[PDB]
């Protein structure tokens, strides 16, 4: 099924030919090594060039961050490795590493080791704690060693790709390769490891225009990806998403599904040939290097697919697997605020679609999983499929038996007891739908609220909402935008009176239907009502609640957390992070 | 005055490695040398004078054999030479030879090369001899109407320094620069004209600002900084004007330029002691400390928060 | 060092009569800073200018 990845451009950096890209683990930085002998550091949040290192007049083919030492390590065609402090811009060290061009640098994640590969057919291991001594030389390639990658699951192993048409897997401490993979008809330019624990896969790209996926335990080719029109210059597994990213001298980046091996998307930004790809663990940002510059793309939503029922059952998706945790199973353990909860996780099975969103219905009996342009409604206890269909968006009504789906930008369908009740076309189209007491429909002109039963327009609001949160009483509604949020009071009695008398009904609905209680200049990421208190997480990683025009901070969060729910019995608010760590606050 | 008490615009500590050229050698190279030899001889003469050597015998040699040259490098080196050479007798009278140099300045102010005019105008900002400036005043005024912004911006600075030091030579300078500021389009020329009015005639600077006050957010950062400096000086001298400018300074806290934000926050604290104004300025400083990556900025802006706390 | 002995002829500050917004006129710190940087600031305390 086609993975609907929302692909957003975060950075566009025009420069000379980019030969390597890397992402900083903690800072919003992209490293780009240029063909003109300069290395640039871009901030992808501010879209600014932060740092520039003039390395040499010759191409810099490899550059890597060493975040733990505040270093940038560069390998240039002058056969020199240069180490720079990225804070002081000072050159810490410089040495001749190889007798020919340096093609790739791999930094060991925990040990003081750098692996370098060269056109001299050698791979060398350097120990920086031993004054950059060469600790080992790996011999056995018969042509240029284009790329090296350390195994993320076993840091003592690395793979090398060579123009000799071979892939060799090496072990630190062995002068001989553990094995050689053969099967490319031309030189191999790129290699990467699958990061997930479930599969022993390698990916390689070659001048034969093929991308091959290998099982490194069985030493077999699992799959061949065909479709690039020129040499494949880069191939990688995404660390978080079930996708493969391949780049080619054809100027295209292709995104493939990592389990079905189908082409999902083809990106062409008009920057000529693609040379390099970098991804970061725990991030959906992907850096792409081209002949005319570099681009950062954000792939999909950063929000984890997770939902909590009113009883404290949490369901989340870990890739395609659905897992359940139960807060009631913790027993009398002293829970501290902001600490990770020790939850017993139960595997519920794999979903047929890639879950982008998971939501319980208001009574917790059913769970909807939305992904790949489909929705599947499961029973919350046993994940039995109860209903399925095609939808772009899904929204539950306040009534646990009703839901709406957005089938297209012009058609909204309302379902009751899993049967289609009504289909209507909103006057200005439907760009998004929101559930709750009223059916919210976002259009290009603003927000319209409709009655779930009659599909009558209650009120139009000139605002572009991102989220709409209703109170359990149905009297209060939060409309969150990209810049601010508004608290509105819904005057249900005035709406009923206006529907009976037809007084005050206009083309924009009932004028008296909503009263504005407040406007707050904070960005809501996630929100929940508890009585007349609106609890939310801000863009600045604060946990706040709004009550009576006052904002009260509950806690300062050290990372982006997502609101799951509030359990009144436990006096605790539950939050989840991107890593599916659940925390609670009193 | 001794060379140590004199105004020093230039210091050059070159090790005189080679035998210090004799005054006779320098004189021969200046008289008979090619343009390169004359250029090197003139550089050596400038360095020797800067290091405290008195070469009065070379003055007329430079006037006769170097001053009439049209070489751009020699023209610029001559401006540095005229900056440092003694122009007066010990009794404070102008040297008779300087009359010949005054005609050369007039020719350079009328030169077809705009950079020679601009460099000569910049040199005239350092001249302290009123008798040399008086015959140049018509040529300096004509440079305000020059087609190149490079000439106009330096002509404003020359008029400002002449007015400041010798008001009697150009008593209409504040009016002339106000009319220039209203008609000017170049941002650097506008800044230099506005800067002159801040120091020479604050009321005319305020009148100009009052016509543009609603547009200040759309101005370039350089002009915004000089406007913030005027608002500070005016509100310091006349506390009743604070009420007029608070709204303008608060809008400048939202400037795209971090330099303008910093100066606007510092000025806002001087305009208002109200808790809301101090909170807005303090938040602007905190936001600058968090967003700015440079530790120099972080430390200095932290010291502004410490100064705020002392109240 | 800040507790100057109040003299009989010193002004009586009536806080009830002072408007709450009278910022003390600080000296122009920019002009003082410029004079200090040029070395033209006579140090206030030590060189009695009438010495």
């Amino acid at each position: 099924m086609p993975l609907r990845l929302d692909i957003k451009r975060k950075l566009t950096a025009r420069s000379d030919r980019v030969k390597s890209v890397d992402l900083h683990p903690t800072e919003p930085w992209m490293l780009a090594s240029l063909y003109n002998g300069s290395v640039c550091v871009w901030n992808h949040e501010t879209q600014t060039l932060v740092k520039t290192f003039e390395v040499c007049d010759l191409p810099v083919r490899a550059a890597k961050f060493v975040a733990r030492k505040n270093w940038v390590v560069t390998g240039a065609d002058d056969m020199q490795i240069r180490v720079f402090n990225y804070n002081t811009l000072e050159r810490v060290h410089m040495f001749e590493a190889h007798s020919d061009y340096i093609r790739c640098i791999a930094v060991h994640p925990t040990q003081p080791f750098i692996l370098t590969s060269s056109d001299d057919m050698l791979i060398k291991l350097w120990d920086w704690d031993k004054k950059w001594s060469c600790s080992q030389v790996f011999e056995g390639h018969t042509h240029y060693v284009m790329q090296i990658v350390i195994n993320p699951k076993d840091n003592n192993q690395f793979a090398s790709a060579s123009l000799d048409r071979t892939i060799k897997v090496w072990q630190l401490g062995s002068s001989s390769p553990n094995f050689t993979l053969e099967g490319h008809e031309k030189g191999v330019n790129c290699i990467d490891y699958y990061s997930g624990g479930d599969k022993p896969y390698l990916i390689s790209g070659a001048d034969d225009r093929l991308v091959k996926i290998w099982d490194y335990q069985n030493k077999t080719c699992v799959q061949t990806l065909e479709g690039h029109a020129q040499n494949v210059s880069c191939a990688s597994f995404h660390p978080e998403l079930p996708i493969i990213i391949t780049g080619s001298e054809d100027g295209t980046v292709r995104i493939w599904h990592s389990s079905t091996y189908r082409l999902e998307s083809t990106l062409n930004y008009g920057m000529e040939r693609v040379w390099c790809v970098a991804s970061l663990r725990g991030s959906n940002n992907v850096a792409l290097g081209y002949d005319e510059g570099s681009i950062i793309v954000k792939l999909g939503r950063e929000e984890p697919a997770m939902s909590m029922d009113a009883n404290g059952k949490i369901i989340w998706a870990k890739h395609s697997e659905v897992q359940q945790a139960n807060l009631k199973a913790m027993g009398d353990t002293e829970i501290k605020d902001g600490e990770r909860l020790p939850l017993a996780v139960k595997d519920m099975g794999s979903c047929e679609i890639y879950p982008q969103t998971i939501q319980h219905n208001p009574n917790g009996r059913f769970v909807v999983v939305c992904g790949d342009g489909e929705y599947i409604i499961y029973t919350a206890m046993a994940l039995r499929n109860k209903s399925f269909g095609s939808a772009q968006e899904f929204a539950w009504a306040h009534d646990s038996s009703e839901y709406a789906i957005r089938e297209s930008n012009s058609i909204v369908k309302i379902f009751k007891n899993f049967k289609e009740k009504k289909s209507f076309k909103p006057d200005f189209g439907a760009e998004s739908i929101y559930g709750g007491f009223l059916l919210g429909v976002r259009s290009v002109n603003g927000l319209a609220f409709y009655d779930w039963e009659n599909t009558e327009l209650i009120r139009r609001i000139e605002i572009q909402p991102k989220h709409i949160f209703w109170s359990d009483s149905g009297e209060l509604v939060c409309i969150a935008t990209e810049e601010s949020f508004f608290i509105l009071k819904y005057l249900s009695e005035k709406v009923l009176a206006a529907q009976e008398t037809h007084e005050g009904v206009t083309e924009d609905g009932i004028e008296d239907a909503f009263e504005v209680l407040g406007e707050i200049q904070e960005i809501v990421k996630t929100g929940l009502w508890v009585g007349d208190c609106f609890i939310y997480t801000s863009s600045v990683n604060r946990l706040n609640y709004y009550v009576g025009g006052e904002i009260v901070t509950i806690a300062h969060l050290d990372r982006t957390m997502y609101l799951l729910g509030y359990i009144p019995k436990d006096n605790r608010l539950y939050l989840g992070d991107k890593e599916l760590n659940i925390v609670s606050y009193s | 005055m001794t060379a140590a008490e004199n105004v020093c615009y230039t210091l050059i500590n070159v090790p005189m490695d080679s035998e210090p050229p004799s005054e006779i050698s320098l004189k021969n190279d200046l008289e008979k040398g090619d343009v390169k030899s004359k250029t090197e001889a003139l550089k050596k003469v400038i360095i020797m004078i800067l290091n405290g050597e008195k070469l009065p015998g070379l003055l007329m040699t430079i006037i006769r054999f170097v001053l009439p040259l049209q070489d751009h490098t020699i023209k610029k080196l001559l401006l540095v030479f005229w900056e440092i050479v003694p122009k007066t007798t010990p009794d404070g009278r102008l040297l008779h030879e300087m009359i010949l140099v005054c005609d050369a300045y007039r020719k350079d102010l009328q030169h077809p090369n705009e950079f020679i005019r601009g460099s000569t105008l910049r040199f005239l900002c350092k001249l302290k001899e009123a008798e040399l400036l008086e015959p140049l005043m018509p040529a300096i005024r004509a440079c305000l109407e020059h087609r190149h912004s490079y000439v106009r911006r330096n002509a404003v600075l020359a008029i400002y320094t002449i007015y400041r030091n010798f008001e009697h030579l150009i008593p209409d300078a504040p009016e002339l620069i106000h009319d220039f500021l209203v008609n000017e389009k170049d941002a650097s020329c506008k800044r230099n004209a506005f800067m002159m009015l801040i120091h020479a005639d604050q009321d005319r600077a305020l009148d100009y600002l009052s016509t543009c006050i609603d547009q200040v957010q759309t101005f370039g950062d350089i002009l915004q900084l000089v406007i913030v400096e005027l608002i500070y000086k005016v509100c310091h001298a006349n506390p009743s004007e604070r009420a007029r400018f608070i709204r303008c300074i608060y809008n400048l806290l939202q400037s795209s330029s971090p330099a303008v934000k910093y100066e606007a926050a510092g000025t806002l604290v001087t305009l208002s002691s109200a808790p809301t104004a101090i909170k807005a300025a303090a938040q602007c400083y905190i936001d600058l400390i968090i967003k700015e990556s440079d530790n120099n900025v972080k430390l200095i802006v932290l010291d502004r928060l410490v100064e705020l706390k002392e109240h | 060092k800040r507790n100057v002995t109040v003299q009989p002829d010193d002004p009586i500050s009536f806080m009830q009569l002072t408007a709450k917004n009278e910022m003390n006129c600080k000296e122009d710190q920019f002009q003082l800073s410029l004079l200090a940087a040029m070395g033209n600031t006579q140090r206030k305390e030590a060189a009695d200018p009438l010495a």
Binding site: G446, I461, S484, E519 | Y250, T276 | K20
Partner: peptide, 24 residues
């Protein structure tokens, strides 16, 4: 006749109204 949310300059007006409430 759509409900207009957000007027440009309201933040400056709110700051000025706060300063006036503080006696400036």
């Amino acid at each position: 006749k759509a409900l207009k949310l957000g007027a440009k300059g309201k933040e400056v007006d709110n700051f000025v109204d706060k300063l006036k409430s503080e006696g400036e």
